[PDB]
Amino acid sequence: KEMRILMVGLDGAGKTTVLYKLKLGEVITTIPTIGFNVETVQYKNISFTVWDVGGQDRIRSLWRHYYRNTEGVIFVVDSNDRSRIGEAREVMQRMLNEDELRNAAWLVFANKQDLPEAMSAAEITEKLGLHSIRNRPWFIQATCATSGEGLYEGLEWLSNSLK
Amino acid sequence: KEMRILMVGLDGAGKTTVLYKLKLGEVITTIPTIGFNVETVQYKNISFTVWDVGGQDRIRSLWRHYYRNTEGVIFVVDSNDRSRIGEAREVMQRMLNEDELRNAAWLVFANKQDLPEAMSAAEITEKLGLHSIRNRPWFIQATCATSGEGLYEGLEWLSNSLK
Amino acid sequence: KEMRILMVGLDGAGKTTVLYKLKLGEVITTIPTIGFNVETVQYKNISFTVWDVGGQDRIRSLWRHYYRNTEGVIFVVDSNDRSRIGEAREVMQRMLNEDELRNAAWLVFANKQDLPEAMSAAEITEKLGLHSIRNRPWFIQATCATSGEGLYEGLEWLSNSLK
Amino acid sequence: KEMRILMVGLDGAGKTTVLYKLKLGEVITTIPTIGFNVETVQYKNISFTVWDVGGQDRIRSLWRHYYRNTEGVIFVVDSNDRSRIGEAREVMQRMLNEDELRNAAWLVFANKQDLPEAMSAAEITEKLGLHSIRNRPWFIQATCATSGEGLYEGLEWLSNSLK
Amino acid sequence: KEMRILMVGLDGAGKTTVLYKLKLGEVITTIPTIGFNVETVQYKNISFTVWDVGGQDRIRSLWRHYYRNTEGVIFVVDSNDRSRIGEAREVMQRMLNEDELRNAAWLVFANKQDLPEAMSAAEITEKLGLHSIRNRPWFIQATCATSGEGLYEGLEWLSNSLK
Amino acid sequence: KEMRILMVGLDGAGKTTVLYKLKLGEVITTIPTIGFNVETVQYKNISFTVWDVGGQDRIRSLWRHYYRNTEGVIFVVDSNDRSRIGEAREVMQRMLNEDELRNAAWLVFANKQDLPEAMSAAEITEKLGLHSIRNRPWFIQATCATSGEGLYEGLEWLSNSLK
Amino acid sequence: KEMRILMVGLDGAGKTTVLYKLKLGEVITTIPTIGFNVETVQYKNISFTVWDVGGQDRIRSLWRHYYRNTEGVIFVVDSNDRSRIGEAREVMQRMLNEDELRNAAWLVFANKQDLPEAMSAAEITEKLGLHSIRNRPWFIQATCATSGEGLYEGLEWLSNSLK
Ligand SMILES: Nc1nc2c(ncn2[C@@H]2O[C@H](COP(=O)(O)OP(=O)(O)OP(O)(O)=S)[C@@H](O)[C@H]2O)c(=O)[nH]1
Ligand SMILES: Nc1nc2c(ncn2[C@@H]2O[C@H](COP(=O)(O)OP(=O)(O)OP(O)(O)=S)[C@@H](O)[C@H]2O)c(=O)[nH]1
Ligand SMILES: Nc1nc2c(ncn2[C@@H]2O[C@H](COP(=O)(O)OP(=O)(O)OP(O)(O)=S)[C@@H](O)[C@H]2O)c(=O)[nH]1
Ligand SMILES: Nc1nc2c(ncn2[C@@H]2O[C@H](COP(=O)(O)OP(=O)(O)OP(O)(O)=S)[C@@H](O)[C@H]2O)c(=O)[nH]1
Ligand SMILES: Nc1nc2c(ncn2[C@@H]2O[C@H](COP(=O)(O)OP(=O)(O)OP(O)(O)=S)[C@@H](O)[C@H]2O)c(=O)[nH]1
Ligand SMILES: Nc1nc2c(ncn2[C@@H]2O[C@H](COP(=O)(O)OP(=O)(O)OP(O)(O)=S)[C@@H](O)[C@H]2O)c(=O)[nH]1
Ligand SMILES: Nc1nc2c(ncn2[C@@H]2O[C@H](COP(=O)(O)OP(=O)(O)OP(O)(O)=S)[C@@H](O)[C@H]2O)c(=O)[nH]1
Numbered sequence A, B, C, D, E, F, G: 001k002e003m004r005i006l007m008v009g010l011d012g013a014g015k016t017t018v019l020y021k022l023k024l025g026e027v028i029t030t031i032p033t034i035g036f037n038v039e040t041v042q043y044k045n046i047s048f049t050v051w052d053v054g055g056q057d058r059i060r061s062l063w064r065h066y067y068r069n070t071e072g073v074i075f076v077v078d079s080n081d082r083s084r085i086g087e088a089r090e091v092m093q094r095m096l097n098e099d100e101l102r103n104a105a106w107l108v109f110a111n112k113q114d115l116p117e118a119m120s121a122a123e124i125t126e127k128l129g130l131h132s133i134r135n136r137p138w139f140i141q142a143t144c145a146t147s148g149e150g151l152y153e154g155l156e157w158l159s160n161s162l163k
């Protein structure tokens, strides 16, 4: 009936694009997210309330204001960006150790799969150290926010962890 | 008057096909079940509420959310898949030891009997270690969800364990 | 209704893997255990509270903090490691002489039996000097945490020493 | 109205099979009993609560946890096993000298009489030294747990020693 | 209701084995007894408190610490060891002259009768000079601690000298 | 639930950087610590209260004000600084002899491992004379406060010595 | 329940190593013992309070401060040091004639048996003139403090002389 979500990731990942592809159905032009966007999207008789936030180094320290009462998390990672996959691992291993996100479900959108140099979801699952997760449910999906592929299959998995 | 059921199994078994052969009467095209499907089907003045779930390795850890208040279980096994009959045995022996499913009735749909290389229900009864069950009623039926054979004979047995 | 357990052993044995094979049902990737993990697992209407600890030489001196109020002990030994079976014997004969573990039940998981060079449970029973135990109940089981074999047969024996 | 029973014996005797032939009415497949099974069976307006335990050499030392508040004992002996009739005599003469079982009624199921090489109940009565019993009521019955013969004639005798 | 016992003898006799055959019922592996073992065993509504001690030449001089308040003595002699039957005679004739053991009852376990070269209890009664005992009750029993024969017939005789 | 920590070391080690890498997650610019910094960081349901202090020769004489009620100590040593490893040994051997830190747990952050000329944790363990510690638990971890490596593995070990 | 011990010997013997192998279980690095170390170790429900002292020629004259109220003595001798076995004999024959140690039990740890040139316990028993002891109980054990062999067999003998 209701669910709260927090979309996060590094800069350039695709968070805003994913959100406004789910909410509107169209690919909008984007500006860097200094503040935050919040939007409700309905699916399977469930109303997800997604909070997209900034990924710039200066806003990554303000994510803590949103950890509270968060039932799911969506970590978006740019697959073409193979040089920052270590920074994302640091961020995610730091945010998995926070106690406010202790029960949160973990979903990972490996975005930008339409690009030729994109890296597979298994290569990302290995590079991010996702099998090391033990206190938490987790899942990884390959997406293309510009085409909508894999986006409605993530909200479908998040439904498993309802209530 | 009412009854709750949980259809489970490995990936590729036939759970969704069975459910929407009971509910609609037609063989639908299928996509992998990331989330869950739920459907009510009426038979013998009884309204079974079936919950079909995913069998992918990543969703097999989310079945626990559904064990509660479950009055029957339907384990679907692909008979042609003779290489994964051990994995199904592991899953079933693990899920028989859970205390939330302590009184649940056990039914086993040995599906895909229309295939030439299919294995008999007795060979499956031996490979799955079903005679080892002692705290539980159990039953095994040979099916073909594409043709509907053996599907209405399972709901008929589940009626024995009403109320 | 309740029971407290302490899983211990040398480094590389399989303690964390055993624990999160009992708790989750899946084989997780692992990191060396510097601190401690604690998890409750239900079985036979009993809630075992298992404490997995480190086996590095530097943490073997901190196990004493956990001996108190411990009702069972699970000593995991790597069978393939035939060169450190003497060190494990030293550790176990030292920890059997402690007075806080005076009534504790002893279980021994001879793990890594899936490996070809693994050594039998009787060869381990001879090398560890287990028949020399006289003030204590004891038992040895052959396991494979990656496949779950022999793991639910140890918790079954620990139930004998309930209350 | 109530009665407590302890089924014991060597390994391979037929304890679990007897119990789940009385409780369910069917011959189940069996696994070695590492822990314990407990089941209530009604007969003649009496509710016997039977505790079946392991017979492996390692569990024979844990039977003492169950001697307390035990009103009847059922010693199952394999008749075909004519090479271990001395070990059973040792076990039974040891367990007859315990003070917690001081008033317990003694029943002996000489099982596996369907086998051609089976030994008579009188030959067993002589080999077990049962006439030497003087502080205790005792009785010996010839059974076949696979067919149920002689099983309901033992619970019938145990009723003599009610309250 | 209570009774205190002192098990003594030469090295290799069978004292520890006898004690932990009475207490546990199983034949344990053994290490030389440098210190002492103490165990309570119940039988015939009597709680014998047995003190097993070392027989090495260096510990035979520390037995005096235990003579006090000792109500019975159990001298174990290896029958196969026909070359040290004179040393045992010396030890026993020395310990019969002590004034702290002035009223103690004397029992002699001629152990290791299962061995082919074992010597009869009468040959031992002659070699040990047991008929020369006049200030003391005495008794000699033939045993086999590995099989338990003759062990419960010694505690039975010790009951004669209760209180 | 709570724990008090004292981070100390020579000047240039990395204490402030470690503290504000644990607390904020970012690498801050730093000024020499004339006074003291104090910060609470949560991890594993434990709230460590860390006190970072100055290492200048003039402030090393004011550390005594903080020894009281200190449950853990974190000695940070610059590995690249191979010319002051003797001064750190002097400081640590002096502060190990204080009676207010009598029960304190010892952790050693060998920091600046990202530098090419850095010295191994074993070379530091030898140069600091850490095996000479006998009245105290101790542990040494290799870190890189700029990257966060090895920092959450020290707080994990400090949890072993809780309460 | 309690016992007081004095560990003594020449320099280089192994006293400190023995003590902190009994107390901690690990082999610590060592410095010459100018003063004294004191540690309580529990075993067999007994709390031994061991006082390790220096063996340098200048501290051998301060041992007298500790002779009082000493219930046991542990003389450690280096077996590899075959050139100072006469000096140890002098020291021990001098300290056996003191009247404060008149009732003390004597134990001798012939340490460093892991070395190839080590001398047997009987050769030491002959060289030290231990059979000449007549006013005192005595015992000699072969050890290896680095491996713990023979250390828990000395505390076991010291228990014989309790109270
Ligand atoms: N070619 C391609 N571009 C994508 C895809 N997904 C997202 N993008 C594009 O990549 C750019 C960055 O996406 P954007 O949503 O603006 O970043 P962000 O996640 O919000 O992070 P920020 O707000 O801190 S800059 C955008 O131009 C967006 O259109 C994809 O699948 N393929
Ligand atoms: N030939 C044949 N195909 C069958 C039969 N029963 C089911 N199937 C087919 O096998 C395929 C898998 O069935 P499906 O229901 O989609 O898997 P699932 O049980 O839902 O598991 P999943 O959702 O995690 S992929 C489908 O193409 C389905 O049509 C059968 O009896 N014969
Ligand atoms: N091939 C095989 N590997 C096993 C088995 N059991 C455990 N392991 C593997 O051996 C490795 C060590 O297991 P692990 O649980 O991490 O050690 P530990 O007991 O926790 O000790 P540590 O934390 O101090 S490193 C792991 O890679 C684990 O997956 C087995 O039965 N077969
Ligand atoms: N042929 C035959 N088999 C019997 C009979 N009674 C029991 N059994 C069989 O003998 C085997 C052993 O019986 P079982 O009940 O499993 O041993 P147990 O008494 O429980 O002892 P355990 O659990 O320590 S292995 C089983 O395969 C069982 O089916 C009988 O009367 N005839
Ligand atoms: N073959 C055989 N061995 C026996 C018998 N009784 C005892 N033993 C064996 O003889 C050996 C010595 O017995 P043990 O109990 O250890 O000596 P002890 O009396 O305690 O004397 P010690 O502790 O000073 S070495 C053991 O290996 C034991 O198992 C017997 O009846 N037959
Ligand atoms: N290259 C590198 N620099 C590090 C590392 N860890 C800490 N530092 C850097 O070394 C410098 C000293 O660290 P700092 O935390 O300010 O010293 P301090 O421990 O607080 O001691 P002080 O306050 O008395 S000056 C800083 O510029 C810091 O950024 C590292 O791992 N690699
Ligand atoms: N190779 C070997 N070394 C041993 C053994 N036992 C003790 N030592 C070593 O011999 C050295 C001396 O031991 P130590 O305990 O320091 O002397 P001490 O008895 O305390 O006398 P001191 O304090 O007046 S210098 C140490 O380096 C110690 O590690 C052994 O069994 N084998």
Ligand SMILES: [Mg+2]
Binding pocket: A015, A016, A017, A031, A032, A033, A052, A053, A054
């Ligand atoms: Mg954005």
Ligand SMILES: [Mg+2]
Binding pocket: B015, B016, B017, B031, B032, B033, B052, B053, B054
């Ligand atoms: Mg499906």
Ligand SMILES: [Mg+2]
Binding pocket: C015, C016, C017, C031, C032, C033, C052, C053, C054
């Ligand atoms: Mg581990």
Ligand SMILES: [Mg+2]
Binding pocket: D015, D016, D017, D031, D032, D033, D052, D053, D054
């Ligand atoms: Mg059984």
Ligand SMILES: [Mg+2]
Binding pocket: E015, E016, E017, E031, E032, E033, E052, E053, E054
């Ligand atoms: Mg002995």
Ligand SMILES: [Mg+2]
Binding pocket: F015, F016, F017, F031, F032, F033, F052, F053, F054
């Ligand atoms: Mg600073």
Ligand SMILES: [Mg+2]
Binding pocket: G015, G016, G017, G031, G032, G033, G052, G053, G054
């Ligand atoms: Mg010393």
